[PDB]
Curated annotation (Swiss-Prot):
The lineage of its organism: Viruses, Riboviria, Orthornavirae, Pisuviricota, Pisoniviricetes. It comes from the Viruses. Changing K37R: In strain: Omicron/XBB.1.5, Omicron/EG.5.1. Residues 2-113 form the CoV Nsp1 globular domain. It is found in: Host cytoplasm. Inhibits host translation by associating with the open head conformation of the 40S subunit. The C-terminus binds to and obstructs ribosomal mRNA entry tunnel. Thereby inhibits antiviral response triggered by innate immunity or interferons. The nsp1-40S ribosome complex further induces an endonucleolytic cleavage near the 5'UTR of host mRNAs, targeting them for degradation. This inhibits the integrated stress response (ISR) in the infected cell by preventing EIF2S1/eIF2-alpha phosphorylation upstream of stress granule formation and depletes host G3BP1. The chain holds residues 11 to 125 of 7096 of the full protein. This is Host translation inhibitor nsp1. Residues 1-113 are annotated as: Disordered.
Amino acid sequence: KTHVQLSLPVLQVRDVLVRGFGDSVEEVLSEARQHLKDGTCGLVEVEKGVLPQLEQPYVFIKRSDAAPHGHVMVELVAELEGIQYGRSGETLGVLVPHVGEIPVAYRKVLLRK
C-alpha cells in the first residue's frame, strides 16, 4: 500500500533516550521509515526549546493533505543545518526512536510510504 495507518506515541522531549535516527539526511529518512514500519517510532511535538534538545539531522512529519478515519495524511521531510529535503505542509512533530518511553498521547496518521 502507498499509505499505512499508524498511531504514533507522543513522547515528552526530556524522556527521549535516543534523540535522533543517525548522521546523514539519507540515513535518518531510512531509519525513520524502518522504525515506522516496525512500530518503534515516537513523535515529539515541536515547541520553543524542543529541537535544540534533539540531534540533527531531524525527521519531521508534515501534513500532505487537508483526514481518512481520523488519520491526518503526512509525509517525511528531513532537515540538516537549516536545509529541508522534501517539501510539505505544516509540521505535526519530529520523529525519534521509541525504546519504551511512556507517551502522553497518540497521533493517528496516514503515512505516505
